[PDB]
Amino acid sequence: GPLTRRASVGQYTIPFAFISEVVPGSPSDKADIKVDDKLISIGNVHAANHSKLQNIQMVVMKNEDRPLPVLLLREGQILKTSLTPSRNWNGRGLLGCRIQEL
Known part of the structure; x- marks a missing residue:
């Protein structure tokens, strides 16, 4: 993550999962997600509240056909x-990537 800087005039950070596979042409591919990315957040799901990943399947089903924010490392x-x-798209499910806990 970014180095600490002095505060200046003028957000999730903790990785919790990683992307081990991405099907070409899938929603995950279209989102520019790459193998070996670490997931920091998807929708409202982040390190503190993913519930051993179960909250991800729920959030993506509920957001079918609607864009969701993703933060990755x-x-x-x-x-x-x-x-x-x-x-x-030509494959199984709503995502087309494999997401596993770190």
């Missing part, structure tokens, strides 16, 4: 993207 950088869970 890639190569040490926190990236913000969005994923639209959907069935309309």
Whole structure:
């Protein structure tokens, strides 16, 4: 994550899962998610409240066809993207990636 800087004039950070596979053409692929990304948040689900991942399947089903915010750690950088869970692609389920706990 970012190094500490002095406060200046002018957010989840804790990884909890990782992405081990991404099906080409899936919603996860379209969201620019990559193998080995670490998941920091998906919708309202983050390290403190994912309930051993069960809250993810619920959140993605409820958000079918609607964009969800995703925070991930890639190569040490926190990236913000969005994923639209959907069935309309050539594969199984709403996501097309495998998400496992760290």
